């Protein structure tokens, strides 16, 4: 459901975006997010390789954010890979695109339908990424997201959520 921190990591490990909005404090904000993002890329690699002797992903439209971005049930792209961590204080969602660009959403609202409401928000942040960062000639590839339009295009949609 709820989101408290957007983290956008690269296709090569280290992150390119995070905003820990409504922290109501000053949190720790330096290279520990870089080593956190690389740790999530590593355990996303490791959770492929262990799988037992077994050898889905159809969301819907819940009207998140208030015309909207899409209409129809779709698929995912990662099966042998990490999808959702669950703990007591928070709950971490993650969403891989097809090209390899993982989106991480830390959630301060805890306790399967949260996947259904979660990835229909994490694709609506992917549409704002592809609309407002890809068409940006000052933005080179493989570089932190220094654009200031991307911040208050996603802030409106997340305060439209919660």
């Amino acid at each position: 459901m709820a989101i408290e921190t957007i983290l956008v990591i690269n296709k090569s490990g280290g992150l390119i975006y995070q905003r820990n909005f409504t922290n109501d404090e000053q949190k720790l904000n330096s290279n520990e997010y870089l080593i956190l993002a690389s740790t999530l890329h590593g355990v996303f690699a490791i959770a492929s390789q262990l799988t037992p002797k077994a050898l889905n992903t159809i969301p819907y439209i819940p009207y998140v954010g208030m015309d909207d971005f899409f209409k129809e049930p779709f698929t995912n792209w990662n099966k042998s890979g990490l999808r959702q961590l669950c703990t007591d204080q928070f709950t971490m969602f993650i969403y891989q695109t097809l090209t390899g660009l993982k989106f991480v959403a830390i959630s301060s609202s805890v306790m399967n339908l949260a996947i259904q409401i979660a990835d229909n928000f994490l694709r609506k942040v992917y549409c704002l990424y592809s609309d407002y960062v890809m068409k940006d000639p000052s933005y080179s590839m493989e570089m932190p997201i220094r654009s200031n339009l991307f911040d208050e295009k996603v802030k409106k949609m997340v305060e439209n959520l919660q």
């Binding site: 290279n31 520990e32 080593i35 490791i46």
Partner: peptide, 17 residues
């Protein structure tokens, strides 16, 4: 430094900035 000693061999590869 990398602020955390952590460990080598839990995920494998470690990293400092």
């Amino acid at each position: 430094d990398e602020f955390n000693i952590e460990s080598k061999s839990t995920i494998g590869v470690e990293f400092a900035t």
